[PDB]
Amino acid sequence: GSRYNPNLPVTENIDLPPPLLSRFDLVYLVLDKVDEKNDRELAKHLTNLYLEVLPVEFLTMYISYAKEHIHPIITEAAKTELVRAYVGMRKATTRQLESMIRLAEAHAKMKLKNVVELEDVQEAVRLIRSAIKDYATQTGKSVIQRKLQEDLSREIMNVLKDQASDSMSFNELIKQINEHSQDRVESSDIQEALSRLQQEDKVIVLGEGVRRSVRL
Amino acid sequence: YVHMHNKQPDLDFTPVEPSKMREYIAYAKTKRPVMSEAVNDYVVQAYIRLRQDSKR
Amino acid sequence: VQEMPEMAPAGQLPRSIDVILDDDLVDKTKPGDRVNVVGVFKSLGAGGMNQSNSNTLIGFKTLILGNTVYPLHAARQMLTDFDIRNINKLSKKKDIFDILSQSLAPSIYGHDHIKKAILLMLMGGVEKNLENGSHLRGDINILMVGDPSTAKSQLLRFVLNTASLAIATTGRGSSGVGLTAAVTTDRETGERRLEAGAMVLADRGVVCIDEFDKMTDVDRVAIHEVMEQQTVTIAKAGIHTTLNARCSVIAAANPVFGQYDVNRDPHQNIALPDSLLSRFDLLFVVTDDINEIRDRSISEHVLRTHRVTIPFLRKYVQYAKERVIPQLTQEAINVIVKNYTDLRNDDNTKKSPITARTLETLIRLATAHAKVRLSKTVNKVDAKVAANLLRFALL
Amino acid sequence: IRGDINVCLMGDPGVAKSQLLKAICKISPRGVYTTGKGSSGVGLTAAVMKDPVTDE
DNA sequence: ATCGATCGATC
DNA sequence: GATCGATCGATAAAGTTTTTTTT
Numbered sequence: 025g026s027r028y029n030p031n032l033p034v035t036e037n038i039d040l041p042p043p044l045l046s047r048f049d050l051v052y053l054v055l056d057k058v059d060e061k062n063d064r065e066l067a068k069h070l071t072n073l074y075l076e077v078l079p080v081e082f083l084t085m086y087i088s089y090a091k092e093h094i095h096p097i098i099t100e101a102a103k104t105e106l107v108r109a110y111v112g113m114r115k116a117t118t119r120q121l122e123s124m125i126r127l128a129e130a131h132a133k134m135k136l137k138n139v140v141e142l143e144d145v146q147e148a149v150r151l152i153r154s155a156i157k158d159y160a161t162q163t164g165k166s167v168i169q170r171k172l173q174e175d176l177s178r179e180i181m182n183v184l185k186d187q188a189s190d191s192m193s194f195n196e197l198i199k200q201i202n203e204h205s206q207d208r209v210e211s212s213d214i215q216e217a218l219s220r221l222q223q224e225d226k227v228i229v230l231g232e233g234v235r236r237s238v239r240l
Numbered sequence: 241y242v243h244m245h246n247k248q249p250d251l252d253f254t255p256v257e258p259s260k261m262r263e264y265i266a267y268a269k270t271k272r273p274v275m276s277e278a279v280n281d282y283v284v285q286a287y288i289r290l291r292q293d294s295k296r
Numbered sequence: 297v298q299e300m301p302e303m304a305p306a307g308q309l310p311r312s313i314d315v316i317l318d319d320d321l322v323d324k325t326k327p328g329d330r331v332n333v334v335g336v337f338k339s340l341g342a343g344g345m346n347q348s349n350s351n352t353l354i355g356f357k358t359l360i361l362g363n364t365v366y367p368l369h370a371a372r373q374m375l376t377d378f379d380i381r382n383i384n385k386l387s388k389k390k391d392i393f394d395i396l397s398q399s400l401a402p403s404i405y406g407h408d409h410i411k412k413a414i415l416l417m418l419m420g421g422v423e424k425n426l427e428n429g430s431h432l433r434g435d436i437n438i439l440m441v442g443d444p445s446t447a448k449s450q451l452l453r454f455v456l457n458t459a460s461l462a463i464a465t466t467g468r469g470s471s472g473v474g475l476t477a478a479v480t481t482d483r484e485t486g487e488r489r490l491e492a493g494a495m496v497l498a499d500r501g502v503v504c505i506d507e508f509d510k511m512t513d514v515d516r517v518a519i520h521e522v523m524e525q526q527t528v529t530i531a532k533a534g535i536h537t538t539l540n541a542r543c544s545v546i547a548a549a550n551p552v553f554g555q556y557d558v559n560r561d562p563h564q565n566i567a568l569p570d571s572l573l574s575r576f577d578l579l580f581v582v583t584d585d586i587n588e589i590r591d592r593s594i595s596e597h598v599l600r601t602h603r604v605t606i607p608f609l610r611k612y613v614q615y616a617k618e619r620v621i622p623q624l625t626q627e628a629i630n631v632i633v634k635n636y637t638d639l640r641n642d643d644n645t646k647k648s649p650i651t652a653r654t655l656e657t658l659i660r661l662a663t664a665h666a667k668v669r670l671s672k673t674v675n676k677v678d679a680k681v682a683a684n685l686l687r688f689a690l691l
Numbered sequence: 692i693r694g695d696i697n698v699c700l701m702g703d704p705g706v707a708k709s710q711l712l713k714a715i716c717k718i719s720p721r722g723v724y725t726t727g728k729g730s731s732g733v734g735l736t737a738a739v740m741k742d743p744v745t746d747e
Numbered sequence: 748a749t750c751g752a753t754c755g756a757t758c
Numbered sequence: 759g760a761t762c763g764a765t766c767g768a769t770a771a772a773g774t775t776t777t778t779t780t781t
């Protein structure tokens with residue numbers, strides 16, 4: 025639309041299969057605001073860089089030597105703090121908890137190119153802490169599902185109770201159901217309310233119109 | 241008016257050949273002025289004057 | 297040469313033979329002329345008894361080596377001092393635009409706004425090409441639409457009998473309406489030619505096609521360029537070539553949603569792209585309401601058709617295509633801009649919005665209307681027929 | 692860094708505004724004109740095509 | 748229509 | 759038997775708009 029739409033679930037903006045969200049360990053957005061102490065400062069950057077060791081390939085040979093020579097081992101000194109994070113985490117399950125070691129290794133592999141480091145995990149947990157700061161507010165969430173299905177169950181039962189036959193036409197269900205509670209959307213809950221209920225011996229589809237309901 | 245004659249004599253302007261400013265574009269192309277420091281002391285808040293009104 | 301496909305009774309497709317001519321009559325025959333030729337009959341070549349193994353192979357190419365290629369008409373219209381003076385005497389009355397209208401289609405009632413429009417279009421208007429500048433649309437391109445079976449397709453094909461070398465197509469969904477697509481057929485073993493589809497014939501003539509909305513997307517981009525631009529240029533498999541064509545379409549289409557032309561938007565009505573609607577001017581909506589004296593009069597005129605004239609009519613226009621063009625009166629141009637700026641302020645407060653190019657119609661209709669008068673002066677009376685003809689097309 | 696900004700227009704007159712833009716483009720230096728048909732987006736850049744009997 | 752190969756004749 | 763001359767036979771050609779299912 026225009027932005028990362030705050031005070032909303034940010035996941036429903038980016039239309040995306042929720043499996044492949046689990047195929048990334050940590051994500052992060054960027055921030056934006058009016059921000060008069062920083063965008064003024066960011067203007068001072070572009071005020072400069074126009075008028076009038078930081079190498080370019082010397083660091084590239086520094087990493088492309090190291091990324092195949094040193095294959096460091098892990099000591100017990102990391103795993104004690106590592107299980108302390110997860111026992112505080114459960115206060116996802118393992119996918120987030122696995123690949124953090126795959127990046128905690130490389131930070132130790134960056135400088136101390138022999139073994140693991142017992143305390144470089146303490147800022148490796150800081151980076152993934154920024155990932156779980158982005159989902160405070162479907163994909164991996166079940167609150168909406170819980171609020172919706174229970175509400176859907178009441179009205180269908182009452183409709184079933186109300187007739188000798190099972191005649192629930194379209195002009196009826198656009199009326200009273202919509203009138204009920206204004207917490208749900210107007211027309212974006214009138215399609216998908218029946219397809220999951222199609223498979224649970226309730227109703228049938230006969231076009232945008234008449235239907236046929238459950239008998240007893 | 242353009243169908244009475246076979247021209248467009250209007251708008252009281254002395255028409256100029258297009259080769260003149262074609263040279264002047266090329267003459268401007270041999271200049272490339274360098275900015276001073278007085279400009280970015282003022283346009284920094286002109287962006288800030290451009291900031292809150294769009295955010296209004 | 298094909299067969300004239302009217303006196304050949306339908307039990308076969310048209311056949312063809314061929315003719316080899318000489319220097320005197322080359323570049324004389326355009327593709328699409330009713331030609332008449334006479335020469336000797338001749339076979340050539342060796343066949344059947346060549347050196348070996350020429351079994352079940354014909355060996356006598358029938359040819360014609362001929363003379364005297366004659367065009368016919370069923371440009372050659374000669375006329376003496378007598379008949380050329382009668383049309384001067386028949387240029388005299390102050391009614392001849394109205395007499396010529398109802399003397400055109402002697403089978404259908406009414407539609408005198410339509411019946412004047414066809415003769416106004418068919419004779420056509422001039423295009424003063426700008427010196428070192430783009431010429432404008434000196435052609436004219438009208439359009440019709442109507443609820444079905446109201447003779448909207450009847451009058452489109454009797455213009456072809458008095459066409460004066462304007463052979464039209466029928467609008468079949470094929471690419472080739474204004475192109476070639478590099479059809480060469482080797483041009484006798486090793487030459488490539490861009491054989492023209494349907495624009496070598498439409499030059500200084502008229503065409504007509506049907507079922508505009510009932511086409512695929514290929515013709516929609518095809519009529520896009522060739523309307524705003526007088527010409528076409530293509531390198532399909534060969535060379536770019538800017539061949540020119542002065543042509544003018546005649547349209548026909550039907551609304552989709554039955555009898556809905558009054559209950560909905562009068563615009564957006566058929567939803568073919570409005571680039572063509574902007575590039576056309578007159579969009580007549582044929583009404584067929586029930587009047588008890590109208591249909592009663594209709595019921596006898598379909599009975600009296602089972603049993604001032606045409607060849608004088610075609611001679612009149614093909615003589616009035618070669619005379620002078622006034623273009624100039626400093627006060628007839630004054631009344632029309634008053635006659636536009638009011639409806640330029642009364643376009644959104646009415647049904648149809650207009651554009652600036654509609655002003656170029658308002659000169660062009662009156663330009664050919666003076667050609668009916670055969671006079672070298674733009675008069676005043678031409679700025680009254682051009683007014684109310686648009687006033688019926690817009691109200 | 693980027694230079695050579697690009698200005699775009701929109702609007703629907705009945706003037707056929709190509710004469711209002713592209714007449715400048717037909718006198719401006721190194722200003723080539725295109726249209727919709729012909730050179731597509733793949734036909735905007737270069738490509739390899741058929742040629743005559745010489746070097747294809 | 749031109750070039751190459753095979754066969755025949757002459758030395 | 760070999761070489762030269764004469765006669766007979768064999769060798770060279772070119773493509774890219776309509777129509778089907780399909781995504």
Ligand SMILES: Nc1ncnc2c1ncn2[C@@H]1O[C@H](COP(=O)(O)OP(=O)(O)OP(=O)(O)O)[C@@H](O)[C@H]1O
Binds near residue numbers: 403404405
């Ligand atoms: N309004 C009318 N006045 C007189 N005759 C008419 C009228 N409409 C139709 N006819 C008769 O109908 C016959 C043929 O009509 P035609 O086939 O042209 O309809 P159409 O224009 O093809 O309709 P559509 O294009 O929607 O199919 C003609 O012989 C004509 O006499």
